[PDB]
């Protein structure tokens, strides 16, 4: 069984659990503080692994005790780390995460880039024959476009049977990332990006942006409590309602869980409509649990 | 010149500077993240040192890289650490501090006690003859009352000329701490404690609580932008208006700066009225600066 490769950046989430969202200028005693491995594509590997799909993670890494914590954790999920790009400068990024016990909301304070990104030349070294799906978390787009061109060139020399399926996520509302819309068989665009571009609903965003994706591609937009929508070459808008848990306790990585679950379902040969449904359900289940493990 | 001893707990402040206060459930890129030594009595040593008063700090400590950072920092200010109480269990407490660049507000997320407190038996080892003033940050009150009884017993065997002046801070609205009101020549009570007990202004709190302090004591209550008030045995309410800086950039430790500056002024023989004024002015100056060093 060929692997699913995720290219992205691992982040250390330093999570403070509070009984209510802190009022500016107050002092509040937290219920707990914990470390959790995070990062979008990183979290998606966790979920893919939990769902039973062998996968590999490619990201930059700075040796030290933080690296040990996050790499050990990836190893626990049997994520293949052959393509870890070790950097002799910079550090693993940290995100300070406030979770409101009352609501499950997650509020993320993150920082400037703390280490070099995975480059096109790094990706050149990947043995593409090992993978049936490659997902790219949009970040350093000019480099990633080259990576995507490399996969495309590879696929031209392949039977349709042996083509590597590609997905990309455009989550941050940064201009440089929009070029990624034209790559990938599946394109995840965030609600935040949609709203930044002036769309007020997933349906609106999908209709508004479909003209930018590559021929044959499926564009997917999750819209929180409003569920998720997709639009493919046939012009039929597809939708799944959200599947909230009875009590929301932790929504950190819920979007990553959605992405992973859609990739999983699609990679398993399911329809887009079913993949959306499955994504919403697994993401919802996740929101009712601390971290990811209880989704299975 | 005998030292001023501060008994309290050193804290590592992990400070995230943000351009606006984060909205719940958002993700925000911080401007910077820095480590700063904190803790109330710890910060007051910094200020006392900067103002030119030799001082000593007594608190619990767990060896490790965090201890090294905070102890090196205390050494930079020439704070005497002879009475550091090393603990073979627990860790230096962390406080997660969000500072709003726009307002200078500080929002503090702190955690359960991470190491043993300084005990009465620890304090027994202090050479009281070395100190002309001892300030206690209220925390483990039952133990600290014994410490205060030890100082009292010491002072009975002294000339008035050689009596150690004592101050206590009651900052958290915790019942156990109220017993400390009856100790100390100078009693700092926080606005938060006052409000918890049903008073709506410093004047109200002082009148409301003076009957609980020891004969001769001065009760002090700072009330933020409303300045600070004090009440002594003569029943005359004293007041200083706040002295805001032209632009408030960082209010973390402003209250500690006030406390230290009042202790300093009083220890220098100044009147309570002048000490209040001086406290408000130095605290105000501090609020216009990052950290403490520019106050002098």
Residue numbers in the entry:
A (entry chain A), B (entry chain A): 3 to 298
What does the paper say about this structure?
Ketohexokinase (fructokinase; KHK) is the initiating enzyme of fructose catabolism, converting fructose to fructose 1-phosphate. Ketohexokinase is a member of the ribokinase family of sugar kinases. The KHK-A subunit has two distinct domains: a central α/β-fold and a four-stranded β-sheet. Gel filtration and nondenaturing polyacrylamide gel electrophoresis have demonstrated that KHK is a dimer in solution.
Residual weak electron density in the nucleotide site suggested partial occupancy of nucleotide carried over in protein purification and one of the bound sulfate ions lies in the middle of the active site. A sulfate ion binds at the expected site of the γ-phosphate of AMP-PNP, probably impeding the binding of cofactor and substrate. In the high-salt KHK-A in the absence of substrate, the side chain of Tyr112 is fully orientated out into the solvent. In the crystal structure KHK-A is an elongated dimer with appropriate dimensions of 44 × 101 × 47 Å. The dimer interface is formed by the extended four-stranded β-sheets (β2, β3b, β6 and β7), which pack approximately orthogonally to form a distorted barrel. The overall structures of KHK-A and of its binary and ternary complexes are very similar, with no significant differences in main-chain conformation, except for a small region between residues 113 and 116 (Tyr113, Asp114, Arg115 and Ser116). The electron density around residues 115 and 116 is weaker, suggesting some flexibility, and alternative main-chain conformations may exist. In contrast, the structures of apo KHK-A and the KHK-A ternary complex did not exhibit a similar closing down over the active-site cleft of the β-sheet clasp region upon substrate binding and the KHK-A and KHK-A ternary-complex structures are very similar without any hinge motion as defined by DynDom. This suggests that the structure of apo KHK-A is either in the closed form as a result of crystal packing or that KHK-A does not undergo a conformational change upon substrate binding.
